[PDB]
Design a protein around this ligand. Structure first.
Ligand code: A1AMU
Length: 166
């Protein structure tokens, strides 16, 4: 957990303009968060990038978890191996509001982070999940009580967030 170059937004929320895969290789944190779907099919975005960095080990492991346990629920999570990126990967399902899933479940999704003292994470429900990313950061700030280091890829988005928060 040797995080460098973050800007502290609140007592427990830190933000950096970085690729979460590169952050994970440099820091080797105890927990890396994946912005997952209910079947753990890591097709693109953050999920696809983390899976690609494990050379598909995360997808083979996720397929076995689904065959044995069934899909997650929206707002839920599971802990699996972090392979070469972290000790553990916390796979969290935020709502896809573009498909009618309730925005209130974004608070439930962020509550999963409180089960871990320190996490490296992306924003949840952003991009194709359709939530406004500045709203997602507000829910994170209001809900997460443990120490979370957020990696934001898009520099234009990072600047808007730092402008609205700090
Ligand atoms: C909009 C946001 C961002 O630019 O930070 C974006 N993040 C990313 O894809 C992202 N963030 C950090 N490291 C990364 N490496 C490769 C991808 C990537 C995102 C889209 C959809 C969801 Br659901 C959640 C986050």
């Amino acid at each position: 957990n040797s995080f460098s170059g973050y800007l502290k937004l609140t007592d427990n929320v830190y933000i950096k303009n970085a690729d979460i895969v590169e952050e994970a290789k440099k820091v080797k944190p105890t927990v890396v968060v994946n912005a997952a779907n209910v079947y753990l099919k890591h097709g693109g975005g953050v999920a696809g990038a983390l899976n690609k960095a494990t050379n598909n080990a995360m997808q083979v492991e996720s397929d076995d978890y689904i065959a044995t346990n069934g899909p997650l629920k929206v707002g839920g999570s599971c802990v699996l191996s972090g392979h070469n990126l972290a000790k553990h990967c916390l796979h969290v399902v935020g709502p896809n509001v573009n498909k009618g899933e309730d925005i209130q479940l974004l608070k439930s999704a962020y509550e999963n982070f409180n089960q871990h003292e320190v996490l490296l994470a992306p924003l949840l429900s952003a991009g194709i999940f359709g939530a406004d990313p500045i709203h997602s950061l507000r829910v994170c700030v209001d809900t997460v009580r443990t120490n979370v280091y957020l990696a934001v890829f898009d520099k234009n988005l990072y600047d808007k967030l730092v402008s609205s928060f700090l």
